[PDB]
Amino acid sequence: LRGRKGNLAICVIVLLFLLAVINLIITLVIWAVIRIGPNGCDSMEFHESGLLRFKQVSDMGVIHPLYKSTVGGRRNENLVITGNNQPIVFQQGTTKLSVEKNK
Amino acid sequence: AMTIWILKVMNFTIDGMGNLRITEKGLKLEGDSEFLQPLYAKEIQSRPGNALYFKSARNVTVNILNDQTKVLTQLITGPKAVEAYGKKFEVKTVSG
Amino acid sequence: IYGWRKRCLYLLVLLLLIILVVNLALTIWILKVMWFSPTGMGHLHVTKDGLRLEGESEFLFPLYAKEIHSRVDSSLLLQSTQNVTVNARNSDGEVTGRLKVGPQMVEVQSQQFQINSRE
Amino acid sequence: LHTVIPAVVVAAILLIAGIIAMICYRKKRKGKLTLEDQATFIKKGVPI
Amino acid sequence: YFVLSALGLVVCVLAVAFAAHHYSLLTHLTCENAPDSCQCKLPSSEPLSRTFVYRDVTDCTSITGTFQVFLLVQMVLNLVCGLVCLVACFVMWKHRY
Numbered sequence: 001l002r003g004r005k006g007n008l009a010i011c012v013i014v015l016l017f018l019l020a021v022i023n024l025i026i027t028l029v030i031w032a033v034i035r036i037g038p039n040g041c042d043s044m045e046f047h048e049s050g051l052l053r054f055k056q057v058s059d060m061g062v063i064h065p066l067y068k069s070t071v072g073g074r075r076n077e078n079l080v081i082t083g084n085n086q087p088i089v090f091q092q093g094t095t096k097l098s099v100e101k102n103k
Numbered sequence: 104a105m106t107i108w109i110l111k112v113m114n115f116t117i118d119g120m121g122n123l124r125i126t127e128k129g130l131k132l133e134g135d136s137e138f139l140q141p142l143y144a145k146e147i148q149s150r151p152g153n154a155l156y157f158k159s160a161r162n163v164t165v166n167i168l169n170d171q172t173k174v175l176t177q178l179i180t181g182p183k184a185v186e187a188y189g190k191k192f193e194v195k196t197v198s199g
Numbered sequence: 200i201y202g203w204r205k206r207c208l209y210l211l212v213l214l215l216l217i218i219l220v221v222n223l224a225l226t227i228w229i230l231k232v233m234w235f236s237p238t239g240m241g242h243l244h245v246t247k248d249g250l251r252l253e254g255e256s257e258f259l260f261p262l263y264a265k266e267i268h269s270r271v272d273s274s275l276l277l278q279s280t281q282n283v284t285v286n287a288r289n290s291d292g293e294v295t296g297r298l299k300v301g302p303q304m305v306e307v308q309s310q311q312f313q314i315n316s317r318e
Numbered sequence: 319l320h321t322v323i324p325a326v327v328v329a330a331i332l333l334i335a336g337i338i339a340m341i342c343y344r345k346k347r348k349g350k351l352t353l354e355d356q357a358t359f360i361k362k363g364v365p366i
Numbered sequence: 367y368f369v370l371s372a373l374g375l376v377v378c379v380l381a382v383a384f385a386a387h388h389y390s391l392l393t394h395l396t397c398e399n400a401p402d403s404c405q406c407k408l409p410s411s412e413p414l415s416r417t418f419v420y421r422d423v424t425d426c427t428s429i430t431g432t433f434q435v436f437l438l439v440q441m442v443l444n445l446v447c448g449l450v451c452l453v454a455c456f457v458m459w460k461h462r463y
């Protein structure tokens with residue numbers, strides 16, 4: 001029947017509508033978890049030359065540089081390797097260079 | 104439009120988030136990484152077979168801060184002089 | 200003629216269908232290569248004020264920064280198998296002061312070697 | 319990526335099928351049913 | 367029958383796409399002979415590169431020879447079968463609508 005075909009078409013319309021709604025929902029979740037604004041997420045940006053800049057503090061945990069990784073710093077700037085109330089130990093086998101708060 | 108904006112912001116190329124890749128262990132960074140704000144760390148254990156470096160165009164002012172962010176001991180490797188400020192110095196041997 | 204009217208109506212329905220299909224394909228892609236979680240992208244977490252990472256972030260290319268810190272409750276350690284080198288350079292990029300921890304015993308190379316008190 | 323995204327390229331063929339179907343909604347079955355007067359032509363365009 | 371004709375059409379289209387992508391990939395790999403295998407790597411600006419290992423291959427010519435011929439034959443057959451399924455659907459709705 002034309003009425004029944006129309007009703008199944010309405011069911012198709014409804015399922016497409018809800019599919020689009022959940023697509024928009026998950027897209028909002030993607031937008032919000034990375035905390036993206038009109039400029040972008042408040043984490044980082046990809047400079048067009050390939051330079052991965054960041055925007056705020058970083059907690060990198062362990063770091064294992066593998067290949068061609070020289071920890072440097074910006075031009076006319078000072079590396080300030082400070083341990084916030086913690087020692088700093090340059091270790092190699094037995095050899096130790098320990099810079100504690102008072103020794 | 105919103106998804107194309109996401110793809111433009113994060114630069115979702117064919118191979119992942121630009122040069123950055125995310126794997127089981129963690130971040131694998133196939134590009135340079137210059138950060139504007141101070142980073143944090145827990146260890147830096149370079150793999151055997153390479154020499155971990157520290158470089159700059161200026162002084163390397165290793166220092167320590169108390170809870171009040173006041174300097175107690177300092178080790179400034181500059182261009183001309185290598186100063187070790189602090190309350191002491193020591194050189195020990197293995198046996199003590 | 201309601202005929203071609205209905206025809207173009209569900210032609211537009213077809214166009215909306217294809218746009219929805221391609222949008223779901225792109226969003227499944229955007230979920231897959233991102234390892235996405237409510238905590239954040241990947242296995243790390245991009246928090247409000249920063250981003251916490253619990254994994255071995257192997258940088259296959261150089262790094263740059265201005266201030267390298269350690270956590271308040273954990274002591275920074277930095278070790279290797281051959282040696283660890285601190286370097287500093289002049290305006291012409293000439294490394295002039297080295298604090299090298301070699302395999303056996305420390306070397307300091309410079310034009311001067313002071314020691315002072317805190318004052 | 320190749321197992322996910324190229325699964326949508328077939329929707330382009332789906333469009334092509336839909337278009338070529340819709341350019342023929344009366345060319346599919348021109349005779350249709352009730353085929354009377356099947357050897358002549360009956361049409362008018364001028365009021366008399 | 368209409369449903370399976372459409373399914374054969376979509377499966378053949380997917381096969382066409384995968385075969386075309388694999389051929390486009392294999393057009394841009396440089397491969398060398400490894401012990402009872404082949405190591406096919408891609409040129410890169412950086413000295414590092416990603417490689418692939420094809421085991422149980424005496425000479426890489428089998429990958430650069432009969433393999434791409436097989437891909438071409440596979441994609442030709444897949445496009446022909448997809449056309450057959452599509453025109454089967456075409457006649458079905460030309461007799462059905």
Ligand SMILES: *[C@@H]1O[C@H](CO)[C@@H](O[C@@H]2O[C@H](CO)[C@@H](O[C@@H]3O[C@H](CO)[C@@H](O)[C@H](O)[C@@H]3O)[C@H](O)[C@H]2NC(C)=O)[C@H](O)[C@H]1NC(C)=O
Binds near residue numbers: 152153281282301302
């Ligand atoms: C501290 O550790 C580093 C890294 O292990 C040592 O640097 C290494 O030095 C050796 C000896 O020169 C290098 O081998 C040869 O180097 C020359 C360049 O001078 C090169 O042309 C040869 O092909 C060969 O590689 C080795 O490459 C080099 N490693 C790196 C990563 O640069 C350094 O010697 C160690 N310090 C001491 C006192 O041993």
Ligand SMILES: *[C@@H]1O[C@H](CO)[C@@H](O[C@@H]2O[C@H](CO)[C@@H](O[C@@H]3O[C@H](CO)[C@@H](O)[C@H](O)[C@@H]3O)[C@H](O)[C@H]2NC(C)=O)[C@H](O)[C@H]1NC(C)=O
Binds near residue numbers: 164181
């Ligand atoms: C980088 O390291 C070098 C070497 O330690 C620093 O150079 C020294 O810096 C101190 C403090 O700025 C200078 O002391 C100054 O002496 C003058 C009198 O000459 C006095 O009027 C000032 O009030 C201050 O006490 C010292 O002369 C200078 N020595 C040399 C050889 O340069 C440099 O300051 C460090 N730079 C940074 C940005 O940390």
Ligand SMILES: *[C@@H]1O[C@H](CO)[C@@H](O[C@@H]2O[C@H](CO)[C@@H](O)[C@H](O)[C@H]2NC(C)=O)[C@H](O)[C@H]1NC(C)=O
Binds near residue numbers: 101102103191
């Ligand atoms: C650095 O300061 C800490 C905190 O004072 C020292 O730890 C203790 O300090 C008190 C008072 O100074 C002493 O009575 C304890 O004997 C110290 N305990 C230990 C285990 O040392 C620490 O000794 C100081 N380090 C140096 C090198 O002076």
